[PDB]
Symmetry: C2
Subunit: 52 residues, 2 copies
C-alpha cells in the first residue's frame, strides 16, 4: 500500500513520540542496523553538523 506510506510514517512518528528517551534510542539503532552502507552515509552526514 505505497499510497499509504505517508500515513504509516505519521503513525510511527506518533508512537515513537510516546516512548522513553532510551526506547527511542534503541529503536533508531535497530533501524540503523538494518540499513545499508549508503544509507549509513547519509544519516551520518546529517547527524554530524548537528552534534555542534
Amino acid at each position: 500500500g505505497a499510497a499509504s506510506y505517508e500515513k504509516e510514517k505519521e503513525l510511527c512518528v506518533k508512537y515513537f513520540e510516546q516512548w522513553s528517551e532510551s526506547d527511542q534510542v534503541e529503536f533508531v539503532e535497530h533501524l540503523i542496523s538494518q540499513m545499508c552502507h549508503y544509507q549509513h552515509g547519509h544519516i551520518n552526514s546529517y547527524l554530524k553538523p548537528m552534534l555542534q
Copy 2:
C-alpha cells in the same frame, strides 16, 4: 516493552517495506526530534559501522 515492543514491531514492519530513501528521510526525522544526548548515543553506535 511490552507496549513499546508491540509498537516497535509494527513500526519495524512498516519500515521494511518503505523505499531506501523513505527509510532515510524517516530516521532523519526521528533524529531531528531527539536530545543532544540521544544524538551522542546514535553517533557512537553509527561511527564504528562506517569503515
